[PDB]
Amino acid sequence: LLLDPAWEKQQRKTFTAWCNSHLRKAGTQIENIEEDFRNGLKLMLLLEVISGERLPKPDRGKMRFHKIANVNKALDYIASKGVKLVSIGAEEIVDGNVKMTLGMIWTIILRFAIQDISVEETSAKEGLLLWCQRKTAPYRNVNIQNFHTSWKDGLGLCALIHRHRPDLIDYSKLNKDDPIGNINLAMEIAEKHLDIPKMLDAEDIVNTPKPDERAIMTYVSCFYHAFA
């Protein structure tokens, strides 16, 4: 794959894993993000888990209009949290519009995992980037400039771990020559020790000239919340 489909594969993997990192707390999972939010049930549950708030009763009815009602409850809830929904409609989610479903899940990740970040009076995506730059500043083999190419060799992720948890990782053993191995190391440590499920495909990140920045921001936001 290249360009839009390559980024779609990355968003599908990472956004599915992020949703599952929350849904596990409610005793469930999704598998296929193009299918498993169409009825609105696990979308409403995801919003309850990440917000700690109660949404209206889900409708388990099998008809398209029941599912549109559920997705509208989800979208009404998201709008109530100050989110301006552009080019998102309940019918298109229920009808399995993959790009709109991914866009909706991104809007949820941004609102509930990134927007309220505040670092040195810098908010949201820019605050998260500033945090990453501050934490990795002394690691000369890291240069965080963005949420895409700066993360491809795995050293930024490994440096975030070393910076906070030097009991887990000997950063001195790492270099840029094994980007796939480095990403896998960060993900294996974070899954076992930081309760952050693996959300990237290391081969896909390393082999794409510019990886998907929404997927990378999603995963990096989990390190921010683990270490905050």
């Binding site: 009991d167 990782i169 000997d170 053993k173 790492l174 094994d178 191995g181 294996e188």
Partner: protein, 88 residues
């Protein structure tokens, strides 16, 4: 050695956690190893045939256990994953 036995015990404990089971490890019957060496990562895939008691009844199981080592990982000896656990 202790290590093949330790991995078979890990397999039974992981199966017990995953399947809400109470299998009691008896012994390793046999082990096959497959090795890979990447730059820093080194991997062994263990194909373990083991005996365990299912309500006191001794039964044979095959467990697939993946053991991954990286020299930068210092919190534990390695990463271990049960991939498969089935009666044979």
């Amino acid at each position: 050695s202790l290590e093949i036995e330790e991995l078979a015990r890990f397999a039974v404990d992981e199966h017990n956690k995953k399947e809400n089971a109470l299998l009691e490890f008896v012994r390793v019957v046999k082990a096959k190893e497959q090795h890979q060496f990447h730059m820093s990562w080194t991997w062994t895939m263990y194909y373990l045939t083991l005996e365990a008691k299912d309500g006191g009844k001794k039964k044979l199981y095959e467990a697939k256990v993946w053991v991954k080592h990286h020299p930068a990982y210092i919190a534990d000896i390695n990463f271990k994953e049960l991939q498969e656990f089935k009666p044979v």
